[PDB]
């Protein structure tokens, strides 16, 4: 499962 | 295992492969990427505070780009052989990295944040700045800190007519552009350039080249982040709107008939009004919880002034000073104010005046720039100085700051293009710029004033250069482009930028954007106006110079230069300086030295310089070559003619190779002393010197 | 016109003529005279605060006499060829200028005040210190700050 | 190879002048020619440096020619001529 994130 | 990386190695980037290692080093920081570009290596670490400071009115952000000398296997030339106070470059990248970022922290977020970048390996090809910007970026996203969207950066060069991505050091040597650019997925954020006289299209074409070309990196950072970033740090992007609207209707008309106040009086009067009035009506209270504390209630008014002034400028190009978005301020140039100083100028523009003064020197007055690329010697010394009285305040003094340096650089970046070569003009020209008044771009006002102060000094500035400060209010609907902005106009525009160059292209462009949406269409229209403005400011500069003074003031000095065949070096230097010291002692002139066979000779007198030059030529002459030449017959003979290329070392014009067709007895041009032109056939038997007259020619 | 000077040129002073230009340079300061003594040239600026600091127990006054190397067509012998930390002379005039002044601010007056003098041209004859003291003086009176008598 | 040697050797102390020469006359000539950095001490210790082994050998071999001759003797090797 992906991390996130402020970028995002 | 210790270390649980993690690294996006993929990305070959316009010729070069880029690595991004995390997980292995400085885990104790919030984010710490280790980027690699071929062999150039930099570690970026971002650490940010989880509290916010109590009395915290601004966002404290600090960047430290630092170069360790060992990254290029050296040991500092410092008396302490450790490296200390930050360099020009150290300080200048730090700014360049900081610029694009600051804007990108979630509105409201006021925590202490400190990105450090450190250069560990320099491969003498890839400049670490661009890498370092990328690294910072990476390291940050990884930190979880509220830092909106990874940011990319690209340096562009100009070869042949090809925008080239990230020109290595060598590739730079042959480029007509050093255009650095950093941006997000959505717009560029910043631009700092140095241009060798190119036009708006070629230049901005640059920008957009870079925008795409970093798009690979931005995507990359994300890739890494995706499985590596720390849990993002929860912070409520502060919403003002609620209370912002509430204060609007209490004062939002009281400012429309407040700013409208032409008379500087109530024009502030209404200010203090609003102030008192509102500060009361809502203000944490007394009584009375709602609204917000009299602390953060400042900001709102500050903000609100913007929203008011700005509307007012899109409907009517009518600014605070009551002038139109296109209208530049009154200029007055002035040269040789305080003569004695090799070149002086008091450029002034509305309320932005600089005193600028040039100073010629020798090679002794060049500055060793012990760099990692390679320790080298700069002969172009812009020094910028912004003292507090220049804005009616007190403070500071000495030890110039980060901007004081960034500006003097910005200006220097805008003049180095239009400089005479050490060939035409073999000097070292200082140039301090003392801002005595600021309110508009002193950084621009400096360059203009220099361009002047330098002609006055006697400089073959190939052309003169202007600069204009520029702004850009931008709404979804309409927008204005401000020519020659005030101090205030900047602190409200969504973009601000300095354009510099000549009337045949651009010498430097610097930009700083705050919001997305600056279509390349809006940009071009912008430099368009800037082209108009700057080539207008230029108009007034010429009204005090238009071309260099013929020469320089006798104090200070020449400084005359000449070339010698390289293989003669030893003979003029002599064993351990034997001959050189003798020559310098006798003629009274300073001599050196190079290796491409270039000699620069200097003193106060033309007499001593000629003496020296003429001397050296005697040791240097003899060539032949041949190579036609001039001279005078010395003696003539029913045999031919002996003549002089100078240096006794005569030659003979054989009675045969005189005038062709018939000469009977060489009384044709027989005049003991009559000057003629001759070519050397070659020192025929023995070490003789044949030579004849096809004057002309072959 | 920009600039609305203004200048007492009169005064030949014991052999040498003394100028005092104002109105043209550093208008943004409260007072900014530009004195000239033959060829030696110094700009004096006085700026003073209009508030007084909250916890303000002494009178904060600061003088910075500074010499730019270009005033005598040089380039500093510094490894950085820019001029930085104040010299003996820089520091010593600054004191010499400061001394006579401090006393002359209206009793009680505790606002931030900072006179800066900067040497722009040195004719190798007239020492700028004396000039600079005069200049400071001028620049100040001009400022309106509570500074009793030139 | 980046960075460099840096090779070192000793010479009898009483030879100093001859290699330095009057006011550096010989030393500068040696350094200019071989392209190697030389110095210097006083216990007769010479350190020679540059990037190439070729330049260092050149220098060392040079200095030894000015430095040699001893005898001593002191067995030695050689070839019949």
From TrEMBL, chain A:
Location of this chain's protein in the cell: Cytoplasm; Cell inner membrane
Top-level taxonomic group: Bacteria
Subunit structure as annotated in this protein's UniProt entry: Homotetramer formed by a dimer of dimers.
Family: Belongs to the RNase E/G family. RNase E subfamily.
The protein's role, per its UniProt record: Endoribonuclease that plays a central role in RNA processing and decay. Required for the maturation of 5S and 16S rRNAs and the majority of tRNAs. Also involved in the degradation of most mRNAs.
Stated name of the protein: Ribonuclease E
Native organism: Caulobacter vibrioides (strain ATCC 19089 / CIP 103742 / CB 15)
Name of the encoding gene: rne
Residue numbers of the full-length protein present here: 890 to 897 of 898
